[PDB]
Amino acid sequence: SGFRKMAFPSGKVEGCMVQVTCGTTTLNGLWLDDVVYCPRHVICTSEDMLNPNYEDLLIRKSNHNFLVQAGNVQLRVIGHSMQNCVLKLKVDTANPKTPKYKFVRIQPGQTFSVLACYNGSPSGVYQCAMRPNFTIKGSFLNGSCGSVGFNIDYDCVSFCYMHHMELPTGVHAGTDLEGNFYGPFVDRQTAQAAGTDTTITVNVLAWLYAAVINGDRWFLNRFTTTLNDFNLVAMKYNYEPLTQDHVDILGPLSAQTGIAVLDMCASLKELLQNGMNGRTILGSALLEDEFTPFDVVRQCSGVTF
Amino acid sequence: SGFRKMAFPSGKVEGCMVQVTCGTTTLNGLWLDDVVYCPRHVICTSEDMLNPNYEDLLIRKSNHNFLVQAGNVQLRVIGHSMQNCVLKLKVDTANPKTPKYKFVRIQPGQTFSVLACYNGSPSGVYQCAMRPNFTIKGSFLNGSCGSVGFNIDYDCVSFCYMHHMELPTGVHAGTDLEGNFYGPFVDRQTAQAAGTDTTITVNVLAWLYAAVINGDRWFLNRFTTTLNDFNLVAMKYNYEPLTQDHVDILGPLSAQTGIAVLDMCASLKELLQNGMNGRTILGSALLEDEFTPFDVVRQCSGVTFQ
């Protein structure tokens, strides 16, 4: 029993984290085979950061400008190129700890684990969802840039996020590992703000299923609803629309608990309308939306790595 | 900025997790140097569960009765002994991935990370506190026994918990790595129940300081309190008493924010009285009690957002 925000074990990623220094700027890199991936903004100073010309800044740099440290060892950079907003530093040694891996782009609503690092040194691990507004509610201090997000699908690490910056509201923005930003953000210092965010409906339902599996059942009711009526309600409360695909994905949980998805939707309708009347669900007084259907099935089964 | 329940990176522990089988029972063990540590109840049968005589069950075992598997490799057990409620299996290979480590016994209120494992295979990592009633509110399924809790300060892994069992209320009980149970519990299936649990007051205060550091001031008030009046009120909401030690421990956060500990205590009093009236603190609608003073200083800026 029990239900916790749970990250993937981080060991396979820990063995890939290095420190990258350019000029006065030091941040984290991801060393896979013979390439170190990091944010391109490592080449900037403060005044470059106002209006950086990355191509121009980069052409001016030599390999030896980039100091790459794997624990105590310096690696030798033998090449450097850019792909979108990520810098690729070719190094002379392949990482002997390189895991089976792929680069994947995730969709808003999906979760992943973040290994937060400072000076190439992993300090913490936590589980996040990509918000509908393409931010993540992370916990990041100065020196955290180049920290990465991932999932583990078997023995294979899917890398999905690299951290680039914090927004004024204290939430975080970054790229996939091909250097494409999540969200309408740029790696410069201009005014930038997160859009208004929405709740991930399908995830809330998943978490309500988790609650039921853990014996917490007071919010269930005799009523069912339709997708359309529910969605009329959801929209009003700044909830993402629930699609047929979402319903299908909850199928397993529905079968296991004996509560159909539109049955559970009627519960969620009531919770949005009435509140929780002083009660909690899985110890929480708000509806949790950072667990996917997959996460719930995983944690309420015991799949391992 | 941001404030998240954060676990320690689990890699140093992942390299120590093995599978231990005795009879039809399989669970997890922790392989450090040339010793594998696991719950002694691995040697129990169906009969044994109420009133196992561990000494008697153990004497009847030989080394080769214990199958230890480290990934693909079988390890050869060359010795076995019991220490309190943990079994120590001497093996013929030292773990080349042994980190710098120590065994520490923690006190209620302390936090740690749990690496949940099944069949010697790591499944997930989460952050926990030792509850005042000496349980932990974990996430554990059958096969999880021998999963461990730990801290990593600097390069050193401090092992503080090994998982033994789930209590009827769905909370968890286990030992330190010297096999001594936390709380009044025993590794038997007789009736036992956790004491009524309380909120970890000092941790809540720490978290309120974290909120102030992260720029939130709405729940502060002009009042102070005496320690004793604070405790009189706190007790009524099932909060642990705050001691002078707890006050001293909050000193650094007090200094950094300019809010005296008893000033912050008065804020907590009011919060308990009023609730949050539709607001959140650091994204929570309840008061969080699973961050220690140390955790807050660790995770937070050293400059407060005024």
Ligand SMILES: c1ccc2c(-c3nc(N4CCC4)c4ccsc4n3)cncc2c1
């Ligand atoms: C349900 C069910 C079991 C849970 C366990 C558990 N219990 C166990 N025994 C009780 C008597 C033997 C065992 C034995 C080997 S592995 C294991 N694992 C641990 N944690 C949570 C749980 C929840």
Ligand code: NA
């Ligand atoms: Na219903």
